[PDB]
């Protein structure tokens, strides 16, 4: 609902300002280091089944909230979550561009 609105806005951002729409954990982590994130979009599959990697995901979630961002956790039982999953399970809409990409 909010989930599908956010993901719509992600695809919109790819058209409107591509430098404010990233996917992939490395890109999204770089954007959070700059505190640039508007919304983090994450599949709950990524928490499901490896301690280090899961911890990396939980740090990211908490850190994004600490940086005045919003996190939206997607089920994978609709087309919306399935699509996020095709983008590696993590994406972000950025509030600001990150000049260093």
Dump the DSSP string for 84-95: HHHTTTEEEEES
Give me the phi and psi of 45, to 5 degrees please: -50, -35
Q: How far apart are CA 92 and CA 71, in angstroms?
A: 9
DSSP H or E run through 16? helix 2-16
Pull the structure tokens for residue 20.
């404010």
Q: Domains of the chain: which residue ranges?
A: 1-101
Q: How far is CA 73 from CA 38, 92, 98, in A?
A: 14, 12, 23
Q: Hey, which residues does 40 pair with through a beta bridge?
A: 71, 92
CATH number of this structure's domain 1-101, picked from the four choices 3.40.718.10, 3.30.1330.30, 3.40.50.1820, 3.40.640.10 = 3.30.1330.30
Could you tell me the resolution of this structure in angstroms? 2.6
- The method recorded for this entry reads X-ray
Q: How far apart are CA 84 and CA 3, in angstroms?
A: 11
Q: How far apart are CA 27 and CA 30, in angstroms?
A: 5
**Which DSSP category does 17 fall into?**
-
């Amino acid at each position: 609902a909010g989930e599908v609105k956010a993901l719509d806005d992600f695809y919109k951002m790819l058209q409107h300002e591509p430098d404010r729409a990233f996917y992939g954990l490395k890109q999204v982590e770089k954007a959070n280091e700059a505190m640039a994130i508007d919304t983090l979009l994450i599949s709950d599959e990524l928490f499901r089944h490896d301690v280090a990697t899961r911890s990396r995901y939980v740090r990211l979630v908490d850190s994004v909230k600490e940086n005045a961002g919003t996190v939206r956790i997607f089920s994978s039982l609709h087309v919306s979550g399935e699509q996020l999953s095709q983008l590696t399970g993590v994406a972000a809409i950025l509030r600001f561009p990150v000049p260093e990409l």
